[PDB]
């Protein structure tokens, strides 16, 4: 009668980043009174080297 | 009698990325007060490579 | 009687980067008081390469 | 008697990119009262090299 | 009877991108006060290249 | 009897670029009261090279 095939390959990615990261005071509502004090001296030497943020295939 | 095939692949890719990041002071609704006081004092190097940020074949 | 073939390929991207980034003082509603105080000297030597923002294919 | 035949290959792509990125005080509502003081001295030298944003093929 | 043959091949690409990019003060709806007050002395050389924003083939 | 063929091969591309940028106070509806103070003191020298925005192919 009937005869049906389907074959599927499914990738599905989502990536969020980054490299060599620094991050400062990130969130402040402020409600009320909120004070902050911070210095740094930093002198900072930053390398950084992501790989690839993928779907990947290879030989 | 009837006869139906299919086939797929999918790739399916979402990417976000930052290289050699630095984020500062972020997000501030201040809704009542807020002080901040920061430097740095930086003197600041930053070398960054990002890889393939990609759906990628090789060979 | 009837017969039917499909093949599909897909490959489906979105992406955001920054190579070398730095972001400051991101996002400020301010709804009531806010001071912000910031240096830095910066003294700053940046360098970045992005690898391909792609579908590819090589060989 | 009847037949049907599709062979599909899609790549589809959305890409936006910084190189040697730098933003600065991306978004203020300033909905209340907001007081923002920040330098920096950069002395910035820059260089950057964004590849093929791009669908792409070799060989 | 009926014989019916399709074949795609579809790239479709959108690009945004910024080669050197120092973006500043980027939304100020200042809806109630706001003040901003930045220098820099920036001493500021830039070089950028930027690769094919394309659909593209080498052989 | 009735025969149908199709071959489509479409690349499609949209494209917005930048060499060299810089992106001074962007959008200001200033609803309030806004006040900016921002010099540089630049000095600036920019080299730029923007490649192929495009669908391409070579050999």
Do not use: E, M
Request: proline share 3%; with cysteine; glycine share 12%.
């Amino acid at each position: 009668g009937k005869v049906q095939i389907i074959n599927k390959k499914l990738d599905l990615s989502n990536v969020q980043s980054k490299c060599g990261s620094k991050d400062n005071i990130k969130h402040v509502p402020g409600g009320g009174s909120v004070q902050i004090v911070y210095k740094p001296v930093d002198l900072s030497k930053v390398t950084s080297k992501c790989g690839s943020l993928g779907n990947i295939h290879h030989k």
